[PDB]
Design a protein around this ligand. Sequence first.
Ligand SMILES: *[C@@H]1O[C@H](CO[C@@H]2O[C@@H](C)[C@@H](O)[C@@H](O)[C@@H]2O)[C@@H](O[C@@H]2O[C@H](CO)[C@@H](O[C@@H]3O[C@H](CO)[C@@H](O)[C@H](O)[C@@H]3O)[C@H](O)[C@H]2NC(C)=O)[C@H](O)[C@H]1NC(C)=O
Ligand SMILES: *[C@@H]1O[C@H](CO)[C@@H](O[C@@H]2O[C@H](CO)[C@@H](O)[C@H](O)[C@H]2NC(C)=O)[C@H](O)[C@H]1NC(C)=O
Ligand SMILES: *[C@@H]1O[C@H](CO[C@@H]2O[C@@H](C)[C@@H](O)[C@@H](O)[C@@H]2O)[C@@H](O)[C@H](O)[C@H]1NC(C)=O
Ligand code: CL
Ligand code: ZN
Length: 607
Amino acid sequence: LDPGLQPGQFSAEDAGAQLFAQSYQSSAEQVLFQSVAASWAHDTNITAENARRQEEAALLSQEFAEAWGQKAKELYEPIWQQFTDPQLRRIIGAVRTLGSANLPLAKRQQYNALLSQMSRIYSTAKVCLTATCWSLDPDLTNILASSRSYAMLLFAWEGWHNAAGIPLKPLYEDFTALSNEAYKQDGFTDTGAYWRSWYNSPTFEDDLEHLYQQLEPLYLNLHAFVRRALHRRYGDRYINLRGPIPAHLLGDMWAQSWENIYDMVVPFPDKPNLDVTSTMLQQGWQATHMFRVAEEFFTSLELSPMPPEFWEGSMLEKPADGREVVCHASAWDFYNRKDFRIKQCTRVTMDQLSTVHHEMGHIQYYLQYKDLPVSLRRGANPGFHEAIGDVLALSVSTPEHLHKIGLLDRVTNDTESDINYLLKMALEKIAFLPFGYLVDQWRWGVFSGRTPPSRYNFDWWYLRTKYQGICPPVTRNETHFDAGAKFHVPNVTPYIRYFVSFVLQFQFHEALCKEAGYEGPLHQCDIYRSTKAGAKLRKVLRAGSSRPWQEVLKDMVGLDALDAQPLLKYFQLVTQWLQEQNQQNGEVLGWPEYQWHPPLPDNYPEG
Ligand SMILES: *[C@@H]1O[C@H](CO[C@@H]2O[C@@H](C)[C@@H](O)[C@@H](O)[C@@H]2O)[C@@H](O[C@@H]2O[C@H](CO)[C@@H](O[C@@H]3O[C@H](CO)[C@@H](O)[C@H](O)[C@@H]3O)[C@H](O)[C@H]2NC(C)=O)[C@H](O)[C@H]1NC(C)=O
Ligand SMILES: *[C@@H]1O[C@H](CO)[C@@H](O[C@@H]2O[C@H](CO)[C@@H](O)[C@H](O)[C@H]2NC(C)=O)[C@H](O)[C@H]1NC(C)=O
Ligand SMILES: *[C@@H]1O[C@H](CO[C@@H]2O[C@@H](C)[C@@H](O)[C@@H](O)[C@@H]2O)[C@@H](O)[C@H](O)[C@H]1NC(C)=O
Ligand SMILES: [Cl-]
Ligand SMILES: [Zn+2]
């Protein structure tokens, strides 16, 4: 480690800690910067040489983290939590958790290579037929969204899960062991315990479970209604009205968001078409327009535009020069207070317009907290960070807002139109809840050792069936590693943040709508051009992780905890309607034929 980046001496106390943090701050931006830059260079241009560079950057960050980490424990370990500066306790607390820097050098290098190899396998996996092969984004994504051929959907789903998952398994095993080894030396029972610790809530798992109990009935009713809609198309051979839904028929590779099957489930087809995808295509929207339209929503609230550096640096379309890139949409803080970028393989659809807003929310958080100490440039918790963009997208998706921006010609305010909208939103927001909840239940079990490698897939499918009421459309065994075919697993990104976000965003939406002086039904609120709403959101964004999330939440919404009531209020009309409709249709809620799997198509896969 360069002498300029090494820690000096400091008194064994608060006053020494404060100069220690400022000295860290000075060195850390360079170290954070070089790490992020090397990761950017790799993820926008996946090559062996860019991986080597990213690994060397990662070693340097570990060197840095070890030096500054061990210094913190030399001086403070027996006394550190009693500092009177709460921001400084947070800075120190982060600094003294070494993580992968606890590993001896040989194991660090092993750990870094595993992350690099897992990333490459996920983002370069292909399904081949012929010499021609399909990538996840856009080819397989488009098949899952637009094919209504059972066999074609099956080919794409099976191909992807087999291509990505199978080779990932042995690496994921080794990564899990090393990660646990690392975090155990910080005093955590396992890596999952460290990940949950970010919410600073001793009742976190019980609180999540209590939220899910309130939300599950909404999901079961949506599920049953959608299952009926699918049965009407695919027939009795491939849909069991008392069984789990085949996991490939819901519009999405992970069955995590169901908005692509909206045309099959829309209650009142004769009302205005609320999926504006076909209008975006007819009007010739491109990625550029989508990012500018999203930006202009943020500036309408008197939040910040995207700086020149964002526009010059960002990757907003998949490269047409054939390069391998990480297509999974992401938002980048380079930790130099100037460079902020999005990397998205943007496609021209309504849900991608929502995703643009999501990623731009991350960026806005970065812009607003850029002058805080680098350890406090985080969301109040990770769920806050995931919620910001989704909150704006809630306003954007309203038929009134879509009309304002030229995407929906007809205006209507009737009960049928409200049901259509709320159903469309339920396919996006309610359908996700079980998946948002289950992914880290799986991963927490892997980290704790409750789920060894011998049960990776068995336990994944247990949770997929238990929560989502889906089944794999072909047989799986423990050679398959279906968890690994979801980005966040091989890319080691925690998932419970998204469950938290999906509840939180309705709390935020309710609070901002009220601050805006809106007095109508919550699901028709649009905060566009509300400078008052913008000011309230800005307070949250400027806090970063400087204060406990419970206090930030309380200032924003009047409550110091996650609460499902705003979400339930938003959806109330369609919750009631789906319940009535399922009862009238004689549906079974749930999937009591839990063992059921669909048969193979007659000629699969030669067709
Ligand atoms: C779509 O239509 C709804 C329903 O409007 C109501 O019912 C219709 C059939 C007609 O009879 C309307 O005349 C009637 O308002 C609109 O929702 C309603 O919005 C109004 C105006 O913001 C709300 O009234 C306010 O209520 C608060 C107290 O909650 C008062 O302090 C205010 O002074 C004001 O009177 C009304 O509560 C609300 N009703 C419901 C059931 O939510 C909605 O605004 C409209 N949407 C659009 C986009 O036009
Ligand atoms: C993709 O990454 C490779 C490196 O792995 C880049 O190729 C290098 O380009 C730089 C100029 O920026 C030269 O100094 C090197 O001689 C090149 N190395 C090799 C091995 O060819 C390439 O420029 C990157 N592509 C893009 C579009 O940025
Ligand atoms: C796991 O499954 C692998 C391939 O899938 C199988 O092939 C299709 C045609 C059906 O037979 C389906 O039921 C199977 O899933 C096998 O190559 C492999 O032997 C199995 N793995 C182990 C460890 O036994
Ligand atoms: Cl998280
Ligand atoms: Zn995100």
